[PDB]
Amino acid sequence: TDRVSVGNLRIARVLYDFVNNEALPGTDIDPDSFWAGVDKVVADLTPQNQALLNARDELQAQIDKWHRRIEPIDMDAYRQFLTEIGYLLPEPDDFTITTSGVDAEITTTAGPQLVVPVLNARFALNAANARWGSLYDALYGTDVIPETDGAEKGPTYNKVRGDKVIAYARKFLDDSVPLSSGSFGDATGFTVQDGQLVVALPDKSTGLANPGQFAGYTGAAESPTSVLLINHGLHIEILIDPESQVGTTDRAGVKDVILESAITTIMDFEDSVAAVDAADKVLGYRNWLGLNKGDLAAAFLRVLNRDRNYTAPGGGQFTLPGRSLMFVRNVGHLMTNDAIVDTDGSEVFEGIMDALFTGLIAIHGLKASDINSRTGSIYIVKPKMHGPAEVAFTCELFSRVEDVLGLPQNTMKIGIMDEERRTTVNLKACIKAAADRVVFINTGFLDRTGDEIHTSMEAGPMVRKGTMKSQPWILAYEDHNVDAGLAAGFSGRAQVGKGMWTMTELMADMVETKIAQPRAGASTAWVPSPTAATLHALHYHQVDVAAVQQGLAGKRRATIEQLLTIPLAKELAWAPDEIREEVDNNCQSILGYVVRWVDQGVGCSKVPDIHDVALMEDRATLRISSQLLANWLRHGVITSADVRASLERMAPLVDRQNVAYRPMAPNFDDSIAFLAAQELILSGAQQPNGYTEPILHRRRREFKARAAE
Ligand SMILES: O=C(O)/C(O)=C/C(=O)c1ccc(O)cc1Cl
Numbered sequence: 001t002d003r004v005s006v007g008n009l010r011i012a013r014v015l016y017d018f019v020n021n022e023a024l025p026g027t028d029i030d031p032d033s034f035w036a037g038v039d040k041v042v043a044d045l046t047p048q049n050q051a052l053l054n055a056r057d058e059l060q061a062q063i064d065k066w067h068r069r070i071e072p073i074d075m076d077a078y079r080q081f082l083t084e085i086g087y088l089l090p091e092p093d094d095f096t097i098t099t100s101g102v103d104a105e106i107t108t109t110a111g112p113q114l115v116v117p118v119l120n121a122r123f124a125l126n127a128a129n130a131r132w133g134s135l136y137d138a139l140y141g142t143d144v145i146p147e148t149d150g151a152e153k154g155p156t157y158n159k160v161r162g163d164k165v166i167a168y169a170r171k172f173l174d175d176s177v178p179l180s181s182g183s184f185g186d187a188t189g190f191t192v193q194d195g196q197l198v199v200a201l202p203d204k205s206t207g208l209a210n211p212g213q214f215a216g217y218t219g220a221a222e223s224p225t226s227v228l229l230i231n232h233g234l235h236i237e238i239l240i241d242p243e244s245q246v247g248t249t250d251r252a253g254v255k256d257v258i259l260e261s262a263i264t265t266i267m268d269f270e271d272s273v274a275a276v277d278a279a280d281k282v283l284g285y286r287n288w289l290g291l292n293k294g295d296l297a298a299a300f301l302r303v304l305n306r307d308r309n310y311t312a313p314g315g316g317q318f319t320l321p322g323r324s325l326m327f328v329r330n331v332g333h334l335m336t337n338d339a340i341v342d343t344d345g346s347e348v349f350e351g352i353m354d355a356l357f358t359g360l361i362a363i364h365g366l367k368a369s370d371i372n373s374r375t376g377s378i379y380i381v382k383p384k385m386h387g388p389a390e391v392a393f394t395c396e397l398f399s400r401v402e403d404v405l406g407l408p409q410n411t412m413k414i415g416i417m418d419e420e421r422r423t424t425v426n427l428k429a430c431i432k433a434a435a436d437r438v439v440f441i442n443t444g445f446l447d448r449t450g451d452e453i454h455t456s457m458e459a460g461p462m463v464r465k466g467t468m469k470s471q472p473w474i475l476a477y478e479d480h481n482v483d484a485g486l487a488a489g490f491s492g493r494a495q496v497g498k499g500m501w502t503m504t505e506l507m508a509d510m511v512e513t514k515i516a517q518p519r520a521g522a523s524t525a526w527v528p529s530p531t532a533a534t535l536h537a538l539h540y541h542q543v544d545v546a547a548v549q550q551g552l553a554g555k556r557r558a559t560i561e562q563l564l565t566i567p568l569a570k571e572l573a574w575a576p577d578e579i580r581e582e583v584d585n586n587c588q589s590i591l592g593y594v595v596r597w598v599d600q601g602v603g604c605s606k607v608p609d610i611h612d613v614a615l616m617e618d619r620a621t622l623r624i625s626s627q628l629l630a631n632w633l634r635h636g637v638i639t640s641a642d643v644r645a646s647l648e649r650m651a652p653l654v655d656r657q658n659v660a661y662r663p664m665a666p667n668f669d670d671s672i673a674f675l676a677a678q679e680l681i682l683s684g685a686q687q688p689n690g691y692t693e694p695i696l697h698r699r700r701r702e703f704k705a706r707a708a709e
Pocket residue numbers: 115116268271272419443444445446447448499500502528604616617618620621
């Protein structure tokens with residue numbers, strides 16, 4: 001109740017102080033009219049925000065009762081019913097996107113896209129610096145080069161493993177920017193003569209099979225420090241330094257091979273951070289503002305990067321950006337947050353808050369620092385939207401914030417998350433709702449799965465979690481997303497993107513698997529680390545995404561029948577041990593992620609599963625695990641005693657795995673973290689659309705209360 005009255009709102013003090021003292025100075029916006037704008041937008045838009053939420057339960061309540069009636073499929077009765085209640089809306093006539101004022105990294109460049117918790121300062125700093133990463137470092141410290149005999153990693157440098165790193169990179173160069181004759185492995189040096197690349201072999205001195213891939217160099221042209229290359233819009237740089245220990249042994253004195261990695265980075269306020277009050281929102285706002293003001297620094301002291309100067313092939317000076325073009329992921333429409341209350345006591349919607357405050361903050365990126373978008377746009381991802389009407393509401397919100405922040409209309413562009421069922425089967429209408437704003441569509445397959453499990457909770461027992469990846473509804477969902485994206489002129493205008501790789505240390509598996517996404521037409525895909533972005537950049541150098549896309553133009557490869565194929569299981573597909581392992585695995589990952597969410601405030605964690613695989617957990621993966629067990633419990637393939645035994649089995653395992661920690665076992669009934677995970681399961685099928693923030697925020701709001709009395 002240390003709150004600031006502005007009209008009908010009682011803004012928490014620490015937030016109000018942060019906006020006036022750190023966010024507003026430099027933007028030339030009168031704080032009085034800003035806060036009056038906050039009060040006006042909240043009062044004018046909260047009614048429909050709440051109205052669109054009641055419409056979700058109302059629709060889901062009918063789909064619950066309909067499933068309670070006994071043929072298997074019948075996509076005929078299921079369809080005209082879903083159109084009757086307004087789930088299935090008409091398909092609008094074809095159209096093209098009008099969104100303008102967008103940067104090259106969105107419209108044209110195809111490459112990895114990094115997502116990072118905005119509450120972790122060092123993470124967001126390295127995520128912003130991730131536009132340029134070392135390939136040597138990515139290959140050495142990772143199992144992409146396996147530790148067979150000789151290539152074992154250790155405290156000192158291993159020349160054997162280091163030699164395999166160099167040999168790996170040499171075929172990358174030969175496979176991405178080849179020579180006319182010979183191979184990069186036998187190159188004895190590099191020079192620039194008469195404005196073109198000349199590489200000396202032991203036989204001769206070949207050039208580039210296409211000289212148009214010679215992007216530039218540093219140092220002198222007759223002995224460069226570095227050679228700049230370009231392939232499929234992505235830049236490659238060879239560092240030349242015979243003085244360095246790696247270059248000392250390299251056949252051409254090469255120290256490293258630099259890759260353009262995360263061309264864009266998403267700053268996340270949502271499923272990968274735990275922010276439940278005004279105090280938590282401010283640290284994310286402060287970090288997000290430091291990234292826009294350029295002065296974000298971590299205690300050496302780590303800072304952002306200036307752009308990279310170069311020499312053209314002719315001799316002129318040019319420059320290339322050293323930072324990733326930053327998005328920001330607001331929170332969805334669901335949750336409220338006591339960062340602001342009204343005179344009546346109720347909490348204001350958290351999504352309205354983020355658009356006003358992250359939007360005010362993003363203005364600092366538009367001007368000079370001691371800089372983000374140069375074409376004048378603000379890039380905001382809005383997740384967890386349900387259908388085209390919610391996209392239009394999301395659009396009127398941004399149109400009201402621009403008016404309040406003064407910016408010209410359509411300044412705040414939006415990347416649509418394609419991760420709920422009602423959006424998936426109404427996607428063409430959702431893109432049109434943001435026809436002049438949309439920046440990307442992206443298949444959030446994890447959240448889309450949890451929504452598929454919940455929307456058909458009453459239908460029957462569902463397939464095991466590891467089986468959703470091969471179910472027909474999700475393979476259509478991906479093609480259907482690429483299709484209607486391209487059919488709207490996204491090619492050349494906006495990104496068509498795909499989802500997340502969670503196995504943080506299975507990068508050899510990532511290299512031999514996430515090539516499928518650029519082959520599927522996606523111009524971008526999600527990586528969890530600056531290192532994974534570097535290793536993901538290899539797939540775009542082997543896949544001409546602009547070629548894959550124009551081959552897919554005019555194709556329609558997914559029917560409405562295919563997208564509605566519910567992933568139910570056939571009777572008694574499972575032995576007892578197969579049932580138990582699924583239960584243990586789901587109970588394990590929930591407990592591992594929740595305990596750090598509730599006890600320590602971390603919204604993203606590495607939790608090993610039952611098979612000892614390190615998994616990057618967020619609220620989306622948590623939505624899948626809880627909803628699956630809550631679905632198996634609802635139709636009776638497990639009992640309520642099986643969950644508690646499994647929860648009490650997996651709890652001391654997590655404790656031993658976990659530092660300033662705190663065990664849940666043995667007196668489970670006392671631990672707030674243990675009780676939270678129990679609630680997400682046993683009350684799982686009654687959380688709206690399976691969302692986990694109601695339980696998580698409340699239990700986090702409860703743990704903080706104890707740790708102060
Ligand atoms: O499939 C989705 O719904 C989607 O949006 C993915 C994520 O949000 C995510 C998952 C795991 C992580 O470690 C990080 C993130 Cl960012």
